Design a protein around this ligand. Structure first.
Ligand code: SF4
Ligand code: F3S
Length: 106
């Protein structure tokens, strides 16, 4: 599975969903997650993310390991998103800011 990590929080560009063949992205107020059992590891989404927040599971940075299980848990409770929508209104201000997990909304 591929995993969405910190820098998606408060950006949520949603470019990643247009390339996913199996539609395994789930939507939260201000972040997206990949459902691990549905992802077929095609790697097509990782180049699409403007925030470069998507990583192959095996390449998730050492200080971002919690996102692995967080993607799994939140994918069981958030709704499925299959279409690109507009970025969060001030996505570019937050793109690049570190430690955004403290701002995650359920
Ligand atoms: S690797 Fe492919 S299947 Fe997995 S989320 Fe990305 S685009 Fe979808
Ligand atoms: S910001 Fe998040 S919504 Fe997709 S395009 Fe990047 S993982």
């Amino acid at each position: 599975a591929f995993v969405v990590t910190d820098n998606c929080i408060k950006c949520k560009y949603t470019d990643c969903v247009e390339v996913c063949p199996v539609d395994c992205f789930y939507e939260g107020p201000n972040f997206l997650v990949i459902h691990p059992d549905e992802c077929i590891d095609c790697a097509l989404c990782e180049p699409e993310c403007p925030a470069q927040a998507i990583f192959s599971e095996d390449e998730v940075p050492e200080d971002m390991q919690e996102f692995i299980q967080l993607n799994a848990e939140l994918a069981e409770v958030w709704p499925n998103i299959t279409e690109k929508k507009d970025p969060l209104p001030d996505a570019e201000d937050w793109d690049g800011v570190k430690g955004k997990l403290q701002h995650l909304e359920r």
